[PDB]
Amino acid sequence: VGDINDTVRSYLDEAGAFRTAVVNNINGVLEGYINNLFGTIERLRETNAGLATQLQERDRELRRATAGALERQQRAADLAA
Amino acid sequence: AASRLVRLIINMDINDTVRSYLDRQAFRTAVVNNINGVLEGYINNLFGTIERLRETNAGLATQLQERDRELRRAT
Amino acid sequence: VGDINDTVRSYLDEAGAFRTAVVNNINGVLEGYINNLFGTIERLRETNAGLATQLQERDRELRRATAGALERQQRAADLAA
Amino acid sequence: AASRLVRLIINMDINDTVRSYLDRQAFRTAVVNNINGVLEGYINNLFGTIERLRETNAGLATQLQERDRELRRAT
Amino acid sequence: VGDINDTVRSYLDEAGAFRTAVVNNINGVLEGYINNLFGTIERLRETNAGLATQLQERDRELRRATAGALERQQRAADLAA
Amino acid sequence: AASRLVRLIINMDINDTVRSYLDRQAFRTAVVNNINGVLEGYINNLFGTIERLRETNAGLATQLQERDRELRRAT
Amino acid sequence: VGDINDTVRSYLDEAGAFRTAVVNNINGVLEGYINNLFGTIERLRETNAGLATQLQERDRELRRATAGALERQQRAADLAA
Amino acid sequence: AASRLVRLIINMDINDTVRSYLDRQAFRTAVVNNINGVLEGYINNLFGTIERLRETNAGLATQLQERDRELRRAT
Amino acid sequence: VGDINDTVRSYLDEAGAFRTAVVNNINGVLEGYINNLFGTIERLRETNAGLATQLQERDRELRRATAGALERQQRAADLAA
Amino acid sequence: AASRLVRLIINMDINDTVRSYLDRQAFRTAVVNNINGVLEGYINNLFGTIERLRETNAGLATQLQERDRELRRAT
């Protein structure tokens, strides 16, 4: 959005020790951002753990299905022989 | 260091706090008046956008209701 | 209601650096109104998208009904002839 | 600044925030006393309006109850 | 409560630029009170409108009932003939 | 100035706002001590009313349960 | 808890103009206690009123039961004779 | 007014307010150091209490599960 | 997490009357933490009481069950004779 | 005061509050610039970390869909 840059250049023109206050505000913004991303990374870890458990569950289901199909085919072949 | 703030916001609450922070005395008052004027113009553009959106919404709603009424007639 | 206008003209008569503070406060107020305008635009965009979806669905079932009616009429005419 | 506020409020919370922020010594004290008197008069007018609302609501409720009894007699 | 008036009188006697602050703060109190007065006005207006709608619909059913009674008595009179 | 405040409190939150607003050094400390003492007297009276209400509630509840037991006996 | 008492004693040692601030703060907390006391008084009054009405209902029920029992016994005695 | 505060706290949120307001230069620094030390001591005592409570909770939980297993095998 | 220690060390170097304010803020934060400590000890006490009640109920149930089992064995012995 | 702070931190909003409060003029500006730089470096490190984590999550989800499709086709 160009409104952001327009406001930034308007502030720069108005300014032309405030730089110290700007730095402090930037540090506070960085702190807020780091808190938000801590939350996001924690929730994504939880989601990844859930997806991994789902993955192993469906892998077990696939193994069971393949084993059952192989057993049925083997017993059918034995009956045929 | 204003460029760092722009890159941080474009790399994405924070915007509103920055704006609230942003908000010779004769020159300062003149600059504040200029800022008020440009913000007022931007807000007028926003009003025009909202009016256009409302007009399109009304037109599409009348079209939808007319088509629904015609379909009910067709039954 | 003209009460707000009356109190504003009363405060202006009071006025005649305070005006700079008034301008700054109204600037903050219009910034909050800018936030409100952004929210309103988002809501209107969502409503417009939903309305477009509804109109396209209406055209779809209308076309279905017309096609069915034409098929019935054509088969009836062919049977009659 | 009066015209700008007038147009901003006619183009549509604005009143709430503006009048919230709204709130040589002899002159200012005297005119503030005058403003206080104006506010007292406005509040008295509003209380009179409240009393009128109370009276019309009471009359409307009584007539509705009487008509309820009228219908109950009619059956 | 007379205790409230006694405390107010004591504090005002102790106070007597203080009066200007007194008047400013009571103006703020007046604004806070007029907010709730506006809210109550709106609520009472809504209640009045609802009760008016109710009276109108009920007068309509009253007219229906009177018409039905007139029809019944006319039928009875015709049968008596 | 007291007339305006009593009119405002009797017009019907107002009490809370006025008390919040109410919230040479020796004279001021002495007079605020007197006001605090009046407040303590009021608070003690209201604590007495609380105690009396609690006692009456307990007695009435005991009577109620005794009468319920009496009715169950009377069956 | 004795911890609060010993910390108050330690700050009394600290003090030994703070008395005026202590007076103001106890005034404020006593205003808060007054609000809480008003709430408790209202709750107690409502509970007392409800219990009194329910007690009157109980009295009426017991009177009806005793009247019914007396009527039954008198009717039985009369029928016996 | 220490006696009044003691009476008020015994007669019973108030603690939070009084210790929120609670929190020459060299003497003040030394007494504040003493305050920090006594707060640290109380904190350590409370942490020991918390650890003991957690250990007892774990012991009761394992006793509950062991007794439930004994009941299940006793059937 | 080393950034917290790094910032604390940097601000200690910046300080080197700052120590008094730092200690005062530490005490304030300690009180704010004491609030949560009181909450947690209350919760732990409630959980401990609940677990004790469940333990006594369960061992009562177990002793009743073993008494019933002994009664059944005794009845079997009686019917055997 | 570093030892007290680290001991309080390791024993578990606490860090949030302590670093919110924690947040000649030439030396102060140099120190705050260094702090800003180290914050930016840490932010870059964690941003790389979250990018790798998002890539891993996306790959795991894609493989999840592929495995589900294979399982439903094998039937």
Residue numbers in the entry:
A (entry chain T), C (entry chain V), E (entry chain N), G (entry chain P), I (entry chain R): 50 to 65, 105 to 169
B (entry chain U), D (entry chain M), F (entry chain O), H (entry chain Q), J (entry chain S): 33 to 44, 52 to 62, 103 to 154
Extract from the study:
Three capsid types have been recognized from the nuclei of herpesvirus-infected cells: empty A-capsids, scaffolding-containing B-capsids, and DNA-filled C-capsids. A unique portal vertex exists at a 12th I5 vertex through which the genome is translocated during assembly. Here, portal proteins assemble into a dodecameric basket-like structure that is thought to seed the assembly of scaffolding proteins, in turn driving the formation of spherical procapsids composed of MCP, SCP, and triplexes. A separate protein complex, the terminase, associates with the dodecameric portal and initiates genome packaging and the concurrent autoproteolytic cleavage of the scaffold.
The resultant atomic structures reveal not only the expected A-, B-, and C-capsids but also capsids with portal vertices similar to C-capsids but no resolvable genome in the capsid lumen, which we named D-capsids. We refer to these capsids as “D-capsids” because their C-capsid-like portal suggests they were originally C-capsids, but the absence of most of the genome indicates that they are degraded. Ten of the 12 monomers from the basket are linked to the turret helices, each of which consists of one long helix extending toward the portal cap and connecting to two smaller helices arranged in a small helical bundle. The two non-contributing portal monomers are presumably disordered or flexible beginning at their turret sequences. In C-capsids, D-capsids, and virions, the turret helices are fully extended, whereas in A- and B-capsids, they are retracted and positioned ~65 Å lower.
